[PDB]
Design an enzyme around this catalytic site. Sequence first.
Site, PDB file in Angstrom:
ATOM      1  N   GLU A  73      -2.576  -7.367  -1.382  1.00 33.96           N
ATOM      2  CA  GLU A  73      -2.911  -6.633  -2.617  1.00 33.96           C
ATOM      3  C   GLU A  73      -1.591  -6.465  -3.363  1.00 33.96           C
ATOM      4  O   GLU A  73      -0.661  -5.887  -2.809  1.00 33.96           O
ATOM      5  CB  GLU A  73      -3.622  -5.328  -2.269  1.00 33.96           C
ATOM      6  CG  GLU A  73      -4.345  -4.719  -3.446  1.00 33.96           C
ATOM      7  CD  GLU A  73      -5.622  -5.420  -3.882  1.00 33.96           C
ATOM      8  OE1 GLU A  73      -6.293  -6.081  -3.040  1.00 33.96           O
ATOM      9  OE2 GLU A  73      -5.956  -5.292  -5.066  1.00 33.96           O
TER      10      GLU A  73
ATOM     11  N   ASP B 123      -1.698   6.044  -8.949  1.00 29.84           N
ATOM     12  CA  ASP B 123      -0.611   5.904  -7.950  1.00 29.84           C
ATOM     13  C   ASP B 123       0.206   7.190  -7.818  1.00 29.84           C
ATOM     14  O   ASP B 123       0.555   7.796  -8.836  1.00 29.84           O
ATOM     15  CB  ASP B 123       0.281   4.709  -8.269  1.00 29.84           C
ATOM     16  CG  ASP B 123      -0.386   3.390  -7.915  1.00 29.84           C
ATOM     17  OD1 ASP B 123      -0.627   3.158  -6.707  1.00 29.84           O
ATOM     18  OD2 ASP B 123      -0.669   2.610  -8.857  1.00 29.84           O
TER      19      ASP B 123
ATOM     20  N   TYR C 125     -13.901  -1.755  -1.938  1.00 26.18           N
ATOM     21  CA  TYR C 125     -12.774  -0.853  -1.655  1.00 26.18           C
ATOM     22  C   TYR C 125     -13.332   0.498  -1.233  1.00 26.18           C
ATOM     23  O   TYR C 125     -13.924   1.190  -2.062  1.00 26.18           O
ATOM     24  CB  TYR C 125     -11.890  -0.714  -2.879  1.00 26.18           C
ATOM     25  CG  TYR C 125     -10.531  -0.184  -2.541  1.00 26.18           C
ATOM     26  CD1 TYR C 125     -10.328   1.132  -2.158  1.00 26.18           C
ATOM     27  CD2 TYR C 125      -9.449  -1.028  -2.584  1.00 26.18           C
ATOM     28  CE1 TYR C 125      -9.065   1.589  -1.833  1.00 26.18           C
ATOM     29  CE2 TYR C 125      -8.184  -0.596  -2.257  1.00 26.18           C
ATOM     30  CZ  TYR C 125      -7.999   0.717  -1.869  1.00 26.18           C
ATOM     31  OH  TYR C 125      -6.754   1.155  -1.550  1.00 26.18           O
TER      32      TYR C 125
HETATM   33  O1  LIG Z   1      -1.618   3.219   1.187  1.00 25.99           O
HETATM   34  P1  LIG Z   1      -1.716   3.933  -0.152  1.00 25.99           P
HETATM   35  O2  LIG Z   1      -2.162   5.360  -0.056  1.00 25.99           O
HETATM   36  O3  LIG Z   1      -0.434   3.769  -0.963  1.00 25.99           O
HETATM   37  O4  LIG Z   1      -2.854   3.163  -0.942  1.00 25.99           O
HETATM   38  C1  LIG Z   1      -2.443   1.898  -1.492  1.00 25.99           C
HETATM   39  C2  LIG Z   1      -3.521   1.399  -2.343  1.00 25.99           C
HETATM   40  N1  LIG Z   1      -3.078   0.262  -3.150  1.00 25.99           N
HETATM   41  S1  LIG Z   1      -4.265  -0.606  -3.781  1.00 25.99           S
HETATM   42  O5  LIG Z   1      -3.689  -1.687  -4.514  1.00 25.99           O
HETATM   43  O6  LIG Z   1      -5.170  -0.912  -2.713  1.00 25.99           O
HETATM   44  C3  LIG Z   1      -5.075   0.474  -4.896  1.00 25.99           C
HETATM   45  C4  LIG Z   1      -6.456   0.517  -4.923  1.00 25.99           C
HETATM   46  C5  LIG Z   1      -7.099   1.371  -5.785  1.00 25.99           C
HETATM   47  C6  LIG Z   1      -6.352   2.194  -6.617  1.00 25.99           C
HETATM   48  O7  LIG Z   1      -6.948   3.124  -7.508  1.00 25.99           O
HETATM   49  C7  LIG Z   1      -8.256   3.182  -7.708  1.00 25.99           C
HETATM   50  F1  LIG Z   1      -8.900   3.518  -6.599  1.00 25.99           F
HETATM   51  F2  LIG Z   1      -8.464   4.119  -8.613  1.00 25.99           F
HETATM   52  F3  LIG Z   1      -8.768   2.045  -8.163  1.00 25.99           F
HETATM   53  C8  LIG Z   1      -4.972   2.151  -6.598  1.00 25.99           C
HETATM   54  C9  LIG Z   1      -4.332   1.285  -5.739  1.00 25.99           C
END
Ligand SMILES: O=P(O)(O)OCCNS(=O)(=O)c1ccc(OC(F)(F)F)cc1
Lengths: 393, 393, 268, 268
Positions: free
Chosen positions: C49, C60, C175
């Site tokens: 990703e 984020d 997701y």
């Molecule tokens: O391990 P962490 O807590 O840093 O999570 C990392 C996630 N990275 S990602 O690209 O999957 C990802 C997936 C969804 C996100 O926001 C949304 F849900 F609103 F769409 C943001 C990042």
Amino acid sequence: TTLLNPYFGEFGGMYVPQILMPALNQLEEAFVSAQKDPEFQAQFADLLKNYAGRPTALTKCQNITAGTRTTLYLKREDLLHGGAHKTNQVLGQALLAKRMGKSEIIAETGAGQHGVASALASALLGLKCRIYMGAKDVERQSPNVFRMRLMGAEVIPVHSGSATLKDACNEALRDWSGSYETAHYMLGTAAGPHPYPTIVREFQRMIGEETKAQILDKEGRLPDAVIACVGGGSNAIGMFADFINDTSVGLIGVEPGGHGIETGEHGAPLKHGRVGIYFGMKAPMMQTADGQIEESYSISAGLDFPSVGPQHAYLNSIGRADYVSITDDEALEAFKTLCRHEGIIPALESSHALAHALKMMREQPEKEQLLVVNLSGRGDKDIFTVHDILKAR
Amino acid sequence: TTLLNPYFGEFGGMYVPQILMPALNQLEEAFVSAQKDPEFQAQFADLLKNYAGRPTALTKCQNITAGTRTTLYLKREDLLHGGAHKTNQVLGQALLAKRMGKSEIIAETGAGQHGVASALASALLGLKCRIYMGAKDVERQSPNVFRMRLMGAEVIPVHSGSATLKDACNEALRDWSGSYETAHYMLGTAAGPHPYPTIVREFQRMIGEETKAQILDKEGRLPDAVIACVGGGSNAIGMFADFINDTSVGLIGVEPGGHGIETGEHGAPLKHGRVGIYFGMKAPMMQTADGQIEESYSISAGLDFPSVGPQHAYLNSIGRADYVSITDDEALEAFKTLCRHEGIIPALESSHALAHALKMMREQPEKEQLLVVNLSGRGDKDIFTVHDILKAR
Amino acid sequence: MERYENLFAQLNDRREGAFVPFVTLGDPGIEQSLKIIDTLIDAGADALELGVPFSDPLADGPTIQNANLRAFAAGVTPAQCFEMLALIREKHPTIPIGLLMYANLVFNNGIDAFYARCEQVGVDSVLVADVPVEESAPFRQAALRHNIAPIFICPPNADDDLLRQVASYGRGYTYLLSRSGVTGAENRGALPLHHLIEKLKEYHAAPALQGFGISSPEQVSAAVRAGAAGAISGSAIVKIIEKNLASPKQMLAELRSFVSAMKAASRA
Amino acid sequence: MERYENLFAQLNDRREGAFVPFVTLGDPGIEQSLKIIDTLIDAGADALELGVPFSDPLADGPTIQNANLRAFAAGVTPAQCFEMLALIREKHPTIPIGLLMYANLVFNNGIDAFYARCEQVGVDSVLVADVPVEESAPFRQAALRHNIAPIFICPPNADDDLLRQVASYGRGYTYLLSRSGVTGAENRGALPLHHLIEKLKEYHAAPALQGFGISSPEQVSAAVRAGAAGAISGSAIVKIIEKNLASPKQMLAELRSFVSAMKAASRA
Ligand SMILES: O=P(O)(O)OCCNS(=O)(=O)c1ccc(OC(F)(F)F)cc1
Ligand SMILES: O=P(O)(O)OCCNS(=O)(=O)c1ccc(OC(F)(F)F)cc1
Ligand SMILES: *Cc1c(COP(=O)(O)O)cnc(C)c1O
Ligand SMILES: *Cc1c(COP(=O)(O)O)cnc(C)c1O
Ligand SMILES: N[C@@H](Cc1c[nH]c2ccccc12)C(=O)O
Ligand SMILES: N[C@@H](Cc1c[nH]c2ccccc12)C(=O)O
Ligand SMILES: N[C@@H](Cc1c[nH]c2ccccc12)C(=O)O
Ligand SMILES: N[C@@H](Cc1c[nH]c2ccccc12)C(=O)O
Ligand SMILES: [Cl-]
Ligand SMILES: [Cl-]
Ligand SMILES: [Cl-]
Ligand SMILES: [Cl-]
Ligand SMILES: [Cl-]
Ligand SMILES: [Cl-]
Ligand SMILES: [Cl-]
Ligand SMILES: [Cl-]
Ligand SMILES: [Cs+]
Ligand SMILES: [Cs+]
Ligand SMILES: [Cs+]
Ligand SMILES: [Cs+]
Ligand SMILES: [Cs+]
Ligand SMILES: [Cs+]
Ligand SMILES: [Cs+]
Ligand SMILES: [Cs+]
Ligand SMILES: [Cs+]
Ligand SMILES: [Cs+]
């Protein structure tokens, strides 16, 4: 699914992470319910009258128009408690928070005026208030930060991205993403995701409703045009809303021209930006060629934001409202003129609207025109900024 | 004493040396008499129809407005004999010269289009024509100078002052000061001393009269606005005159913005100059702080003059007409767009009017509006200028 | 292509979960980012990703806010990110590559054109973090026209209507959000998700990957045990980059150790 | 003050005409122009007519067009001209000083303010070359409020109404135009003017000075013989400046010889 249309033509929408959609749906339902609830309307009217001091005056300014066929009135939101129109809608949103059973308020601020408005409404109505502010704005707005803390609000500096208003907007939404079951996000303008553009308009529309009643009482007719500055769009849509169906009334929004549109150092996305998606909405943006959100500029912090509420973009697109810009220097001249000729110290935000009305008069001084400027705030807060610029000249 | 009002509110008058007042009085009397003379009107109508080719087409331009609520027509003065609207009024003034018993014509020119128009009218009607042209303009306009000489006109370079159009205007009046018993001064625009602003309007007003009849026939209503470029003011007042009393019809004049108003390198005195007295009139001027007449600038020589006719200044002052500016770059884009989307090569002068109509459309694409642009001339003359600019990019 | 479908079929045949790291493209620079990504793959990443640096990453937390800022300090642009993506695919033909986008970067030069460029460089999925299912139509339509999986979010408080929408519209993977709030290793999900996982399978959703707050091997094992197809970890990976900016060699060693341990937790 | 009235009374007592040169202020530079003007006075000028350089002198032929251009090449401004006028008056208390203006320079910073500045520096008259009697009201009113004579033009083709207007409105002197056209020594007036001179006296006009094309002593004598109070010469004077730009000494010698000869022609 929503109760109300989230779009104004192509503009607006609900561009938030999925996690925030229940918060927006809950808020929309609470608002639609509140708008039908006579007890809610009565408590809002009571606060607006007995706490904020509505109705505000409509002042005829005869000295500044002498020898022309312009008649100019100023709608005196500068006289509202807190010194700006922001007070109207923070009282309504605080009542929505209480309707939903919430005890906490989140707010963003750049100039600090919305932070102070959110803090005062929260102090009055027994809500715990936390305010996000870009670290660069915290440094520039010590007086407003101190006012927020005097009223018992928490002020949280934001160090991410450009450490300014868009960054505080992001941080407020990050917090709400994890806290909406307990906290209401008191968004500071007629922008962001649905339902905020609609709510903020309806909680500011008393500006235009009073103006209409006052001008009919005093002049026996509607204005030829109503003129308002556009930061995010709240004071302007509050003045405009009640006139939208009066097709003879011009609606003129004034964006900050900063150092001049040609310099790129301005805050005029509606006429000089590009449609994008940011802060939960599809709206005109200042942005780089590759789609990063750009830095806006104005002498006035209240106008300094790289986007604009979607209803303004829509009213422009159909030709119902016209949008223009006024530079720092034009705004400063209008500020000085109102001080010297009317004894009113206007906000530098509001001075952009006044500067455009003065241009309408001066360019065509034998044109008969009845104008209202929304004097969105008082300019006590700006005398240091104005002192520094006059000194540097 | 005069038969007609020499002023439009505060603007206009007869600011000539005393020696020239009998010439202006004689011309005014001959014009007032001619306007009541059916034989004069019939000979003028015959020339306009059978020699110049009136009426000119009114062309609906569907490709350039596709996907918007703008309907755009172009009034095709580009199709008039000589390729510009100037032909209309030179035929009328040549007939006035003959009415007064005169055999000689004096004319000024900058771009050379008025010089050619004066020369062709003089060739047709048996008048001896002499044309004053600033030496800098002679050097830049070899094609037009050759056309004038092919038609038997004398072309006299002017080396005094800035050796450009205002200097040729001065020289024409110097000559007339010593020759008016035998020569008529065929002034090239709706400016200068009374009675020229009035005469040139009345000898161009068929533009607007035909436009009104054509738009009613095609659309069953009047336009929302008519839009014309403003060099000295003749094509614009010719389009505007018949609509002045139709209060619903917008009248939009477009001054050249050159490199941008903020650069000072423009030709937009009506909105960005200062009232002065020059070329026989009280009118907005580009001038130095101490009152010397300034150098104007436009990509288009036909718009490059530091003043404007007094009726435009008056219509602006009362709010009947609105004046805007269009930069070189905006005009060039409009030129390219009309070539590519309609197969019409517009004059760069006329391209300023088209550029503003395109901006009215693009800024508010869902606004319903019926617009007419006066396409004052054809742009064959400009293809070298446009080639050179596209090459340098 | 069918890169997620092929991956999940191969993992299913080994009774194995997917481990999917997140990093920001060009953090801390283009060359080091390419080395980081090759190390993640070599150490056992099943899919990637990859974030395109954006001015306003409002899903984020601070760790990934700071990754975006480091990439901007290195002058990283979306155009440079698409050059990196083309080179990653040129080296690694089967690993599924998912982008983490914000809406303005997709909309900027036209939604259709964005997904056409993703197809050209060999991206497999796009998650647009600030486009909820309500706003998703032009994004998901353009994705499918260009053989890109549109990735939908299933929050912990998802109702039946949202489960059916995410299940119908999504492709590649679903997701499965651990928790409310924003990305971050400092905040662990403490809601059981096996009910959402079971409803998603009942509605024939793309296989679930759990994401947000996954920082430890036991969480990867727990995700698989709950019925998820795997787990995504971002902040925990990005923290190793942030901690080791001064030692690129130690950074790659610690990333290898961490990804190895997280991937081991996915195995039967 | 009454400088023209005093001059004409003194000349009348000597049965003498006035000789009045014109020059452009600051042609060919400020210092040389001040020396030229002192030489004109020393050589016998009775009054002066002084032009302020203007971008568009549309009553002037090439000789004075070129004087304006030389003053502009020297950077001469109206403000510098008013400094020169103050110093001329500080040196010469009784000589009448008339300005030759164009309307825009008078109107530029306000008509009243222009004539107030003329009074402050000790100017006696202003002729605005492109303001006919029809447009004269605000100019002549401001002139009289500030003790400035407004100078009106009597053309050769003047009708009785114009003679009565010029006679009533004017002060100081009446400008009797020799001929149609513009300033220049290359074009001599060939119309008798004694009838206009007699009508002007009948209507109590300010005394007449003949101007345009006066370049020789016999013309000065002829003007006086016809009943005029004197004559103005500009181009003939300015030609001596133009011819002698390279020899400032010879320029002053030739100006002295010329003015001496022209003034001798005015004497009884
Ligand atoms: O391990 P962490 O807590 O840093 O999570 C990392 C996630 N990275 S990602 O690209 O999957 C990802 C997936 C969804 C996100 O926001 C949304 F849900 F609103 F769409 C943001 C990042
Ligand atoms: O000797 P010449 O032929 O050069 O004549 C010099 C005259 N210089 S002046 O200032 O008197 C003078 C007087 C009047 C003028 O124009 C006007 F009549 F229209 F008002 C111009 C110059
Ligand atoms: C906040 C503020 C503005 C700008 O905000 P809008 O939402 O556009 O009204 C304008 N004027 C004043 C005085 C303000 O405080
Ligand atoms: C001469 C000319 C103009 C400008 O002159 P106006 O008097 O302002 O009309 C405009 N368009 C064309 C084609 C011209 O030839
Ligand atoms: N910066 C101003 C107004 C404001 C608040 N929130 C905004 C959002 C967008 C535009 C402007 C604003 C303030 O904080 O008082
Ligand atoms: N310069 C153009 C138009 C023109 C003629 N006379 C003018 C006077 C003023 C302004 C413009 C003009 C031409 O000669 O064809
Ligand atoms: N407190 C947990 C669980 C939770 C409670 N309410 C929620 C609403 C949405 C998502 C999750 C939750 C979290 O924030 O994740
Ligand atoms: N030809 C002489 C006399 C003259 C004839 N017609 C005129 C008209 C006005 C002034 C003078 C005249 C001149 O031009 O001066
Ligand atoms: Cl929509
Ligand atoms: Cl401050
Ligand atoms: Cl409008
Ligand atoms: Cl008037
Ligand atoms: Cl050419
Ligand atoms: Cl209008
Ligand atoms: Cl796939
Ligand atoms: Cl006197
Ligand atoms: Cs007024
Ligand atoms: Cs109106
Ligand atoms: Cs703004
Ligand atoms: Cs159309
Ligand atoms: Cs209109
Ligand atoms: Cs012009
Ligand atoms: Cs699916
Ligand atoms: Cs395991
Ligand atoms: Cs008199
Ligand atoms: Cs004599």
